[PDB]
Design a protein around this ligand. Structure first.
Ligand SMILES: O=S(=O)(O)OC[C@H]1O[C@@](COS(=O)(=O)O)(O[C@H]2O[C@H](COS(=O)(=O)O)[C@@H](OS(=O)(=O)O)[C@H](OS(=O)(=O)O)[C@H]2OS(=O)(=O)O)[C@@H](OS(=O)(=O)O)[C@@H]1OS(=O)(=O)O
Ligand SMILES: O=S(=O)(O)OC[C@H]1O[C@@](COS(=O)(=O)O)(O[C@H]2O[C@H](COS(=O)(=O)O)[C@@H](OS(=O)(=O)O)[C@H](OS(=O)(=O)O)[C@H]2OS(=O)(=O)O)[C@@H](OS(=O)(=O)O)[C@@H]1OS(=O)(=O)O
Ligand SMILES: O=S(=O)(O)OC[C@H]1O[C@@](COS(=O)(=O)O)(O[C@H]2O[C@H](COS(=O)(=O)O)[C@@H](OS(=O)(=O)O)[C@H](OS(=O)(=O)O)[C@H]2OS(=O)(=O)O)[C@@H](OS(=O)(=O)O)[C@@H]1OS(=O)(=O)O
Ligand SMILES: [Mg+2]
Ligand SMILES: [Mg+2]
Ligand SMILES: [Mg+2]
Lengths: 517, 207, 517
């Protein structure tokens, strides 16, 4: 009461191989469902079939949504990191929330007054054992303000279990966090905790110099031969002969390679222009999707892929990449004018193009009587001899994810890009102390529903330590860097419009530094 | 498991991420080629964004426990799921890495997908379903798809303003990063452990 | 004020042979009778005769009602305990109440406002010497919320003494707790105390494998004989002969046994269906009851008994077992549709059936001239050679009871099932500090009646340590366990309906593990 909790510590630092940063901001915490649980299943769906089936509840508590970058780093520093280091990973993390302030609110005749009620308190905790359904990683909105000065509110919390559409199987668990320890905290009382990561391969934040098809010297040839002559073009009697050749400095396509492009999944090629697209609603039909327990659904935000080939800016995977609406986007049918679609013209070195075919294989077995068939191959699996690179980062997006604690997993690198962990940073959940309004003078068997509408605020602290690998390359020529366009514009990039409301001009990736393959 | 791949995300919220929910413009009879987009609708959670993916799969032949539900042809060795090796073509089970069936499909089960255990007192051949104890896999319908079921659907070529947008079906599949599953169960009325082939190339040598 | 009192500690743990659990919840404390005592006798009865006579008072104070299980344990854990251990008992207990908040309330023109009055305080204590009428054990309602998230109010307190109906004997004591020490506690000031149990036989939480009648081997016989031939069926002259036999593997009923079924009391057999019951109001008349000082009354919730015999689901003792209305039950005449009657088809091994006769004995003395009489025996007493098992637990019910400090007691095992103690955990009583409203400017001889309507809240902590005995049996076959039905239902069991209000689908017992008799 007569003392503050903690100063405002929010900056960045570059000690070299490490880079510590934190973000101090403020929030607000409103009551929910009037401190009451709920059962939210497809009974509240109103339309969908065994496709959008969901069976869960709504806890009166709330959680934190800071799993992004543009909310942890500033624009410039991001630039700083990107244009300088090849790879990075998170090392340490901390959390502090303090300077809490509870304010009850009376509503006498539409004339409401907001007073302060320090007598109240709050309860919050962390799920270390990961017994609660990990929610983040789903990249729900309502993240920490990608901006510092602006404050926000913490989103309520709700989860889902196994369900048979409008109903649920017995194997549908049920949870209630109020069955856990919670740092009961009153105003004046601060709160902090500590977390640490584990080893994870640094997100390869770099672009390659060569390609799989072109990693071999040109001046030489391959002492190895190949079938370059099925028939004999010795006239009109092109019989069945067997001519062979070697690594032609010109026939480098027919040459010999030792590696192979990563796995793939065929997507539907759409375009940024309108007239280039057919005239049929295939958004949910001609789309690439999978099937699960009848509950058929999309197979993205992604796959492990690259958007398109050279000079195909117009076309992009239908559901292959990410989509980020500029500041001020509604919930539906907004136009391309608002969003910032993610171009993947960067991985066209290792990963194929989803909108594109993948390969072509033998259909049966050619012979002197029956013709030689050549089948096409759009979809594929993985095999030894395949190498690729997962999705990029896009600070205007997720930062890390949650690995499903199961037995069978493979290269658990996220499909929304980022980092995966078998033991990820916990989930932070909070609620306002249930202040029972005026109780009946005489006894009653039932429970209390009456309360006092109240909420609180405070400062969110998060120290994220970081690891990095800087470019040590001898690339003689000036590689490419990322920089705000050096010309004169009306509203500076990442600047605050004359109304304080600022946005991001464009999305940003990492694969910039030309790292030799 | 308590949840599913498709439903591991909160419902109360949405995804600040958008997706292609409007190929054409239902603005009348002139449904041109437009580009409407949406976000993680608490209702459109199917079209929502997910980060993981169902384990690998292999299409099986869906049979049934009842008789009249099965066609009338001997496909036990023909319409069956099998592989090929040095001409020595053979079945591809007792199994694959899979789940038997979807919800309320007790009647149907993979033809050769799961295990079969005859109750005490079973001869060597043609015994009936009355004796054996077929293994129901209505448990992994959370991570692993259904062998008797299709797996996915992918783009066939490349739609365009003149040529229609094709959508090919995908029964068989391979593995990729972003896939997670769970091998077969135990069944104490069955094997306890196995033997890994001492070779060089092996992967998730789970039996 | 500038500090909270104690975190929210409420979970379960299984260290093995012990299991500690606690429940953190919140409550509310309203004033009562305006801080005034009362004399409640059959003067406020309005109807009843020397049958429902009561002479007591109403203290302005309140007490705690947490003597149940479903309010101390969660559903799953209960399952955990039951399906795993044969027997258990309580070992240690603690209590903490804090984060108090007093809120006065003004009422200006129907326009009331609830402010905070930290200046106030509260007074609460514990009765160790057991000088106050033990109230719990009577299983009054208003228990701790069998649920965690929901908060409640503490029930007022009132007791009763010896009375002659509408009046009371001089031997009718009088009590006033305000004549005891009370931890005067102001907000910000926490409160805690400590308690420990004493030795008590673990509630035999198990079902038997055999029966009294069938605990003997079948392959053999008994070298002992018995009277199996009164007359001689040697024709039409069935004289008086004396044939004898031994333990026939078929005549095992006539065989020899060494033990005997526990005591009994005849109940009225009713049924769950309607047409099976006669058409007469015997609810209070044809009922099993006792007599005391003219004050005739029922003889239950129970006796020491088993509900019914095999396949008699329809019939159950009229007043023999317990009754628990599902969530949302009024006070009277509700139907069977709401309650959850307790089936006792479990003790049909040791304890007879109350609705059933008990035995049959000789009436006089048969002889060659006078016929042999055989009287029936419905009611019984106890004798050496009798063994039984008291009532079950039913977590949707009481947890322990209070033994009457007297001289003559026997197998003080509760009739409402549970545990009995000669020195049970104390009773917790609280009240709000009497805040005398505006006193007259000039003097007055009389006392002050004017006050300020106010109340408070806080968190109830209760650490209950537990002892257990796990199944070590070599029962080759899979014994039976308790589990939620593995099918698909609309509303999951013990789940929160889509309105937060959750209930219990069915009652639960312990005698599950097949323990060899
Ligand atoms: O054994 S394989 O089926 O894999 O094929 C190699 C040999 O099979 C043939 C003929 O079959 S045989 O009975 O095994 O000797 O298969 C090819 O032709 C058969 C029928 O043809 S034939 O005219 O009698 O020779 C067709 O089918 S089937 O045998 O699988 O039922 C196949 O063709 S088709 O595309 O359906 O028209 C074809 O085999 S396959 O489908 O490609 O596997 C002979 O094939 S051949 O080389 O094309 O002539 C092979 O034997 S051969 O006599 O040495 O040619
Ligand atoms: O290069 S691709 O084959 O991958 O396709 C894109 C462009 O190829 C076309 C035409 O070919 S071109 O000679 O490369 O310019 O392919 C599409 O049409 C060709 C023949 O068509 S056309 O009427 O002359 O335009 C067909 O085959 S082939 O070129 O592969 O031999 C294909 O269609 S079909 O399904 O067999 O009928 C079709 O290509 S594909 O099979 O889908 O790959 C043009 O295609 S188009 O966009 O559909 O018109 C593309 O060039 S374009 O002139 O810009 O359209
Ligand atoms: O001593 S007992 O009463 O316990 O019984 C055994 C002997 O008593 C009798 C006769 O009584 S005596 O005066 O003690 O000798 O009792 C039985 O008969 C008497 C009267 O009967 S009798 O015809 O004169 O023999 C009845 O009553 S009473 O004596 O108790 O007043 C009893 O019967 S009844 O059910 O009321 O009809 C009956 O005795 S009891 O009630 O069963 O106890 C003789 O009884 S007998 O064996 O049935 O004949 C016994 O003496 S005996 O002469 O050896 O038979
Ligand atoms: Mg063939
Ligand atoms: Mg083609
Ligand atoms: Mg007599």
């Amino acid at each position: 009461v007569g003392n503050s909790s903690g100063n405002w510590h929010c900056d960045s630092t570059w000690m070299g191989d490490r880079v510590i940063t934190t973000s101090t901001r403020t929030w607000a915490l409103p009551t929910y469902n009037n401190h009451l649980y709920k059962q939210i299943s497809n009974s509240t769906s109103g339309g969908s079939s065994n496709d959008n089936a969901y069976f869960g509840y709504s806890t009166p508590w709330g959680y934190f949504d800071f799993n992004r970058f543009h909310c942890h780093f500033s624009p410039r520093d991001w630039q700083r990191l990107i244009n300088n280091n090849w790879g990075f990973r998170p090392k340490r993390l901390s959390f502090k929330l303090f300077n809490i302030q509870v304010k009850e609110v009376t509503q006498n005749e539409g004339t409401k007054t907001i007073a302060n009620n320090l007598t109240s308190t709050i309860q919050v905790f962390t799920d270390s054992e990961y017994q609660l359904p990990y929610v983040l990683g789903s990249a729900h909105q309502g993240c920490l303000p990608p901006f510092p000065a602006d404050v926000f509110m913490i989103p309520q919390y709700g989860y889902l279990t196994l369900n048979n559409g409008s109903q649920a199987v017995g194997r549908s668990s049920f949870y209630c966090l109020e069955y856990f320890p919670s740092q009961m905290l009153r105003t004046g009382n601060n709160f902090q905790f500590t977390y640490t990561f584990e080893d994870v391969p640094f997100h390869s934040s770099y672009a390659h110099s060569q390609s799989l098809d072109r990693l071999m010297n040109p001046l030489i040839d391959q002492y190895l031969y190949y079938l370059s002559r099925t028939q004999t073009t010795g006239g009109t009697t092109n019989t069945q002969t067997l001519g062979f050749s070697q690594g032609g400095p010109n026939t480098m396509a027919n040459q010999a390679k030792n590696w192979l492009p990563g796995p793939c999944y065929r997507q539907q090629r759409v375009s940024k222009t309108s007239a280039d697209n057919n005239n049929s609603e295939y958004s949910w039909t001609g789309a690439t999707k999978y099937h699960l327990n009848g509950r058929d659904s999309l197979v993205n935000p992604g796959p492990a892929m690259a958007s398109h080939k050279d000079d195909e800016e117009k076309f992009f995977p239908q559901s292959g990449v990410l989509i980020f609406g500029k500041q001020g986007s509604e919930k539906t049918n907004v136009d391309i004018e608002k969003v910032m679609i993610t171009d993947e013209e960067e991985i066209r070195t290792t990963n194929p193009v989803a909108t594109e075919q993948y390969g072509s294989v033998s259909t049966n077995l050619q012979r002197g009587n029956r013709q030689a068939a050549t089948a096409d191959v759009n979809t594929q699996g993985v095999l030894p001899g395949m190498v690729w690179q997962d999705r990029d980062v896009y600070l205007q997006g997720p930062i890390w994810a949650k690995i499903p604690h199961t037995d069978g997993h493979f290269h658990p690198s996220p499909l929304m890009g980022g980092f995966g962990l078998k033991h990820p940073p916990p989930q932070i959940l909070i609620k306002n102390t249930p202040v029972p309004a005026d109780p009946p003078t005489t006894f009653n068997q039932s429970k209390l529903n009456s309360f006092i509408t109240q909420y609180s605020t405070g400062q969110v602290s998060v120290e994220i330590e970081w690891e990095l690998q800087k470019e040590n390359s001898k690339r003689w020529n000036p590689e490419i860097q990322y920089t705000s366009n050096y010309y004169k514009s009306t509203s500076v990039d990442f600047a605050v419009n004359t109304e304080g409301v600022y946005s991001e001009p464009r999305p940003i990736g990492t694969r910039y530094l030309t790292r030799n393959l």
